[PDB]
Amino acid sequence: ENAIKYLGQDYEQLRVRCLQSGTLFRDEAFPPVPQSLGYKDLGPNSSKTYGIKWKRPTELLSNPQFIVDGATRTDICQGALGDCWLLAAIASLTLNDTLLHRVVPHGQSFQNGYAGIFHFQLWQFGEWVDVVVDDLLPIKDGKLVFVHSAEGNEFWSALLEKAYAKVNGSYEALSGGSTSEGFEDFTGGVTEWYELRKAPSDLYQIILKALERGSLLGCSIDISSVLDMEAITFKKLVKGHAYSVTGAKQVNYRGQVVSLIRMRNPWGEVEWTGAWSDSSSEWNNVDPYERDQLRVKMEDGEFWMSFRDFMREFTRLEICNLTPDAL
């Protein structure tokens, strides 16, 4: 019920100590040094680390905020790191309000009570643990190098990504991964995998129920070989790339009931251009209320597809349920 302290570090104790001492926390466990960034691609002498510096948000802007207009999936915009699986897990997590509020302790701020330390809860090896970080973040050309919010002064997702790097020993360790790991590390649940070509006839209903329960869902397109990793298709889907599944709804359309599914590219941009895409003409033949409820004309990485097209274009689905045997 109460989280174990990762590496014995006590968030409240350290915060109060720094606050009374008039100093900012510096994390001995995960210091702002090259090793923290990485070892090969992000290694000490890699050109990928050119110009990277470590700065706290308070050393960057005037009024840095932890959470702005809520901690939501639009705050998850991938940086220069191969951790799409993890960022898709975070975006999916934001749809489960209870779990989101466990992983991200709200009420942390850069104002009252600030001592340069933040904390997060992660499910690790069968137990919840509390991971602290200092708020030094990798910056290049004045901007965050890795994950960032669409809101430039919002830092909760950057700090959560840093905490996850910390438990993995470096940012580079997060490059290339499996969405199921992030889902489970944020929920304590277990993921079931679906091969779309061989799915049960009621997969759409399974997806609806799972989204309703607050389960976490993701999807992806298989790669044919190494060199079509991250290939962008003609209709602007990305292969070998973790997407969050963020919604589903049936609408009346041309005399039939059509099932739609909504998903989000953790890039926060580059979307499907086919039927039910933000600017597609299908929305012209949908009820004006349902159109207003579902359709958002915004280059934000999130878009709708018909379930038929979803089944045609994507290859895999993952569903991470918290209590799969007790619904």
Ligand X SMILES: *[C@@](O)(C(=O)NC1CC1)[C@H](C[C@@H]1CCCNC1=O)NC(=O)[C@H](CC1CCCCC1)NC(=O)c1cc2ccccc2o1
Does residue number 320 form part of the binding site for ligand X (CB under 6 A)? no
- The annotation status of 108 as a binding-site residue, yes or no, is no
- The annotation status of 292 as a binding-site residue, yes or no, is yes
Residue 241 falls in the annotated catalytic set = yes
**Min CB(262)–Ca ion separation in Å:** 9
Choose, by CB under 6 A, the member of 83, 130, 300, 302 that binds ligand X.
Answer: 83
**Min CB(15)–ligand X separation in Å:** 33
Q: Which DSSP symbol is given to 238?
A: B
Nearest-angstrom CA–CA distance, 161 and 83: 9
- The annotation status of 285 as a binding-site residue, yes or no, is yes
Choose, by CB under 6 A, the member of 12, 202, 230, 287 that binds ligand X.
Answer: 230
Could you give the angle at the alpha carbon of 67 between the alpha carbons of 157 and 27, nearest 5°? 55
Q: Which of 246-263 are b and which e, b meaning 16 or more Cβ less than 10 Å from the residue's Cβ?
A: bbbeebebeeeebbbbbb
Residue 84 falls in the annotated catalytic set = yes
Does residue number 167 form part of the binding site for ligand X (CB under 6 A)? no
Nearest-angstrom CA–CA distance, 30 and 169: 8
Does residue number 77 form part of the binding site for Ca ion (CB under 5 A)? no
Choose, by CB under 5 A, the member of 14, 56, 66, 75 that binds Ca ion.
Answer: 75
| 108/220 with CB nearer ligand X | 220
Size (the chain), residues: 327
Taking a C-beta distance cutoff of 8 angstroms, is the pair 284, 55 a contact? Answer: no
**Min CB(167)–ligand X separation in Å:** 17
Identify which range of 89-97, 146-154, 171-179, 287-295 contacts ligand X by CB under 6 A. Answer: 171-179
Could you give the angle at the alpha carbon of 317 between the alpha carbons of 165 and 221, nearest 5°? 80
Residue 321 falls in the annotated catalytic set = no
Q: Which of 294-313 are b and which e, b meaning 16 or more Cβ less than 10 Å from the residue's Cβ?
A: bbeeeebbbbbbbbebbbeb
Choose, by CB under 5 A, the member of 192, 228, 269, 278 that binds Ca ion.
Answer: 278
Q: Active-site residue among 77, 96, 241, 320?
A: 241
Nearest-angstrom CA–CA distance, 214 and 237: 25
Considering only residues 299 to 318 of the shown chain, the ones binding Ca ion according to CB under 5 A are 300, 302-303
Q: Is 327 exposed, middle or buried (0-12, 13-18, 19+ CB in 10 A)?
A: exposed
Q: How far is CA 156 from the centre of its chain?
A: 11
Does residue number 178 form part of the binding site for ligand X (CB under 6 A)? yes
Annotated binding residues for Ca(2+): 78, 83, 285, 287, 292
Annotated binding residues: 78, 83, 285, 287, 292
Residues lying near Ca ion in the complex (CB under 5 A): 68-69, 75, 278, 298, 300, 302-303
